[PDB]
Design an enzyme around this catalytic site. Structure first.
Site, PDB file in Angstrom:
ATOM      1  N   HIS A 211       0.807  -1.227   0.000  1.00  0.00           N
ATOM      2  CA  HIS A 211       0.000   0.000   0.000  1.00  0.00           C
ATOM      3  C   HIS A 211       0.849   1.290   0.000  1.00  0.00           C
ATOM      4  O   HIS A 211       0.270   2.376  -0.104  1.00  0.00           O
ATOM      5  CB  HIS A 211      -1.075   0.035   1.096  1.00  0.00           C
ATOM      6  CG  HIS A 211      -0.559   0.138   2.493  1.00  0.00           C
ATOM      7  ND1 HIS A 211      -0.124   1.342   3.016  1.00  0.00           N
ATOM      8  CD2 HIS A 211      -0.504  -0.803   3.460  1.00  0.00           C
ATOM      9  CE1 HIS A 211       0.216   1.084   4.270  1.00  0.00           C
ATOM     10  NE2 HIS A 211       0.019  -0.197   4.575  1.00  0.00           N
TER      11      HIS A 211
ATOM     12  N   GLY B 201       2.448   5.991  10.269  1.00  0.00           N
ATOM     13  CA  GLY B 201       3.848   5.880   9.885  1.00  0.00           C
ATOM     14  C   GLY B 201       4.526   4.608  10.367  1.00  0.00           C
ATOM     15  O   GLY B 201       5.676   4.338   9.997  1.00  0.00           O
TER      16      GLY B 201
ATOM     17  N   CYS C  99       3.567   1.602   9.548  1.00  0.00           N
ATOM     18  CA  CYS C  99       3.414   0.534   8.563  1.00  0.00           C
ATOM     19  C   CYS C  99       4.752   0.029   8.087  1.00  0.00           C
ATOM     20  O   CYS C  99       5.684   0.810   7.949  1.00  0.00           O
ATOM     21  CB  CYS C  99       2.535   0.982   7.405  1.00  0.00           C
ATOM     22  SG  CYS C  99       0.860   1.436   7.905  1.00  0.00           S
TER      23      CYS C  99
HETATM   24  C1  LIG Z   1      -4.377   4.942   5.633  1.00  0.00           C
HETATM   25  C2  LIG Z   1      -4.578   4.169   6.935  1.00  0.00           C
HETATM   26  C3  LIG Z   1      -6.043   3.852   7.160  1.00  0.00           C
HETATM   27  O1  LIG Z   1      -6.576   2.934   6.189  1.00  0.00           O
HETATM   28  C4  LIG Z   1      -5.789   1.879   5.793  1.00  0.00           C
HETATM   29  C5  LIG Z   1      -6.426   0.889   5.059  1.00  0.00           C
HETATM   30  C6  LIG Z   1      -5.695  -0.185   4.584  1.00  0.00           C
HETATM   31  C7  LIG Z   1      -4.344  -0.255   4.854  1.00  0.00           C
HETATM   32 CL1  LIG Z   1      -3.472  -1.710   4.453  1.00  0.00          CL
HETATM   33  C8  LIG Z   1      -3.693   0.742   5.553  1.00  0.00           C
HETATM   34  C9  LIG Z   1      -4.417   1.821   6.061  1.00  0.00           C
HETATM   35  C10 LIG Z   1      -3.764   2.853   6.959  1.00  0.00           C
HETATM   36  C11 LIG Z   1      -3.616   2.447   8.423  1.00  0.00           C
HETATM   37  O2  LIG Z   1      -4.411   1.676   8.960  1.00  0.00           O
HETATM   38  N1  LIG Z   1      -2.558   3.000   9.065  1.00  0.00           N
HETATM   39  C12 LIG Z   1      -2.171   2.811  10.409  1.00  0.00           C
HETATM   40  C13 LIG Z   1      -1.517   1.671  10.875  1.00  0.00           C
HETATM   41  N2  LIG Z   1      -1.253   1.406  12.160  1.00  0.00           N
HETATM   42  C14 LIG Z   1      -1.631   2.302  13.060  1.00  0.00           C
HETATM   43  C15 LIG Z   1      -2.296   3.512  12.749  1.00  0.00           C
HETATM   44  C16 LIG Z   1      -2.720   4.439  13.733  1.00  0.00           C
HETATM   45  C17 LIG Z   1      -3.381   5.579  13.375  1.00  0.00           C
HETATM   46  C18 LIG Z   1      -3.646   5.853  12.040  1.00  0.00           C
HETATM   47  C19 LIG Z   1      -3.253   4.986  11.060  1.00  0.00           C
HETATM   48  C20 LIG Z   1      -2.569   3.783  11.380  1.00  0.00           C
END
Ligand SMILES: C[C@H]1COc2ccc(Cl)cc2[C@@H]1C(=O)Nc1cncc2ccccc12
Lengths: 296, 300
Positions: free
Chosen positions: B41, B143, B145
């Site tokens: 992603h 961030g 990820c």
């Molecule tokens: C763009 C975002 C939301 O939607 C999706 C949707 C799908 C995918 Cl594979 C990634 C994301 C991203 C996400 O979850 N990131 C995050 C991962 N961990 C902690 C987070 C804490 C707070 C904010 C985001 C976090």
């Protein structure tokens, strides 16, 4: 989201762990520049040390034997001068911490790191660690930017299963001595400022059930704290909690009224951050660090 | 003595963390040999997160679109391929800090250490378990990820998890290092929810054995149970079924403490019925389920 007990990344400290053998005893040493620091009980410590020669101390860094070229004692730590400076020596300092402060421990056996955990120096100067035989010399540390602050070296386990040790200058935390004699940890108390910081972390993570409309005086709260074996909350603690108070909108004395109600009434089958007990091993700085994402 | 939630030393993994930037997105990559692994992603834009065609987005990319930073050094991407939900960026330099490693896919109940990272910089290490509902209860902000889950048994790093997303309940979903998600999750911003979580029964029993090894016996009782009667009671408290594999796995701890597995099952049943009555077990007022039988033996 999420709130975990998190240790600092241990890599800068792993590159410093060595095995120190003297006679039948084997424990861990911390190799920084050309000195190996380890508990002096590896050997009347002045009388015992004068009898030992450099080649009696076998120091092993990985599969490489380091040659000891000198030895001296500083309080309860033995300092073995070696011929080779540790090329992996990070930027570091020796700092003595206060009760309530937290640090990461790199548990080691035979100079090999096996685990890392986060813990707090209890108000009774012990740490509720996890150590088996051969863990002596394992170190406690914090990281600020790229600088490792070494604050603890493991020396012993008390009869209650808790641990006692020194700063890196060999001064014990607490009223402990490094010998086989009757020693006991004093009655422990809860680190109040840390519980409040953890309650703010719970609010930041969306857990608000314990919040109430009430606020208390610092003096009335400390009467409650004394009754429940909680450390007194000082104006310094209130000031330290200021940023968390501003972020959540819960003033420290407003959160103290929540803490007081929790102490007098309990959790009532509920949990806070997945815990049925009030957690006191996260400082206000740990909470800010984790609920903001500071890197090293 | 003592029982702590203990993570593996993170040094072998810290030397592999890099920052991966593609357009406006920046996340973490795992640099092993001459390949950087990261969530696919990273190639997604604003209108892509709902229904992204990763094959279509990736074919439009060139090597110079992926900026990889290892410390203050930019690595040059010389190739890219996708394997399931992970992007594999071939770089022109092998990581000199690459440890002995393997990619392992874990099963629910298994534990691992997480090196949480932001901008390719490690900020913390904690211990996790793969929940029965395939999520992890991590501590991650935006961030993070690309942050990885691992175990370090005998100098070899076993990479088992890569963080991809946060579900609406605050729990985390991710993949193994081959890009296969754990659980019924997809790397799309479409409505997804974690299934009801359950307690990892075999782990609670292992932790009760750790408590006995550390000298706590208050919760033990004179009863035994059949495996079927234990499961009928335990399922009512949202506990995972205990299988004969789990009973076999607990055998060494049963032999060390002298308490039959089904006897420890009877103590667990009673704890579920009575609660703790103001008491704690290993400093906890709740039954801990993030220590496997292997972790308990390792630590004790
Ligand atoms: C763009 C975002 C939301 O939607 C999706 C949707 C799908 C995918 Cl594979 C990634 C994301 C991203 C996400 O979850 N990131 C995050 C991962 N961990 C902690 C987070 C804490 C707070 C904010 C985001 C976090």
């Amino acid at each position: 989201s999420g709130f975990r007990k998190m240790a600092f990344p241990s890599g800068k400290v792993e590159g410093c762990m060595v095995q120190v053998t003297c006679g039948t005893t084997t424990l861990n040493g911390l190799w920084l520049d050309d000195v190996v620091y380890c508990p002096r009980h590896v050997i009347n410590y002045e009388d015992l040390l004068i009898r030992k020669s450099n080649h009696n101390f076998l120091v092993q860094a990985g599969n490489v034997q380091l040659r000891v070229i000198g030895h001296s004692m500083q309080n309860c730590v033995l300092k073995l001068k070696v011929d080779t400076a540790n090329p992996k020596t990070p930027k570091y300092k020796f700092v003595r911490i206060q009760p309530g402060q937290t640090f990461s421990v790199l548990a080691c056996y035979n100079g090999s790191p096996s685990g890392v955990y986060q813990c707090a120096m209890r108000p009774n100067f012990t740490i509720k660690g996890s150590f088996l035989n051969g863990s002596c010399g394992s170190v406690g540390f914090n990281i600020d930017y790229d600088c490792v602050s070494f604050c603890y070296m493991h020396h012993m386990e008390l009869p209650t299963g808790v641990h006692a040790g020194t700063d890196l200058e060999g001064n014990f935390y607490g009223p402990f001595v490094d010998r086989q004699t009757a020693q006991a940890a004093g009655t422990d108390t809860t680190i109040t400022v840390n519980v409040l910081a953890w309650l703010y972390a719970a609010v930041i993570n969306g857990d608000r059930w314990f919040l109430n409309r009430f606020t208390t005086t610092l003096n009335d709260f400390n009467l409650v704290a004394m009754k429940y074996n909680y450390e007194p909350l000082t104006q310094d603690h209130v000031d330290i909690l200021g940023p968390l108070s501003a972020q959540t909108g819960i003033a420290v004395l407003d959160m103290c009224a929540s803490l007081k109600e929790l102490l007098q009434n309990g959790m009532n089958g509920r949990t806070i951050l997945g815990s049925a007990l009030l957690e006191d091993e996260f400082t206000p700085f740990d909470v800010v660090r984790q609920c903001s994402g500071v890197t090293f």
